[model samples]
Target: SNAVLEVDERDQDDEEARREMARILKELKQKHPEKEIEQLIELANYQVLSQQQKSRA
Candidate 1:
């Protein structure tokens, strides 16, 4: 699980990021209730990574 360490700009402590995650996480739960918690967190991490990478563009 080295991906855990691959994170560079994680938004875990940001107020905006927290609110953003809360909104998306809620929607995700309603849309895919069958998804495992680990699966969801992994997906979120990937998404945040992609966004962070794009922020430099």
Candidate 2:
């Protein structure tokens, strides 16, 4: 699944976080079968970046 996510690997210290995100995305894709993986990847990337921005700020 790590290889599957096309998003840039940002935080090497948070591999678990990234893995957990991948799991969530997996379940999300399972729940929404029609949605494409690329869309999910972008959505996840944006969501994480937004959260990181707020946290950093």
- Taking the candidates one at a time, how many backbone clashes does each contain? 0, 0
Could you give candidate 1's per-residue lDDT for residues 1-57 as a string of tens digits?
555446456444679878988887788889998898998888887887887665554
Tens-digit lDDT string for candidate 2 (1-57):
456557665654578887979897988898999999798988888887777764442
Error of 1 at 42 (Å): 0.5
Estimate the TM-score for candidate 1. 0.61
TM-score per model over all chains: 0.61, 0.57
The local distance difference test score of each candidate is 0.79, 0.79
Over 4 Å off, model 1: 1-13, 54-57
- Which one wins on TM-score? 1
Which pairs, if any, clash in model 2?
Answer: none
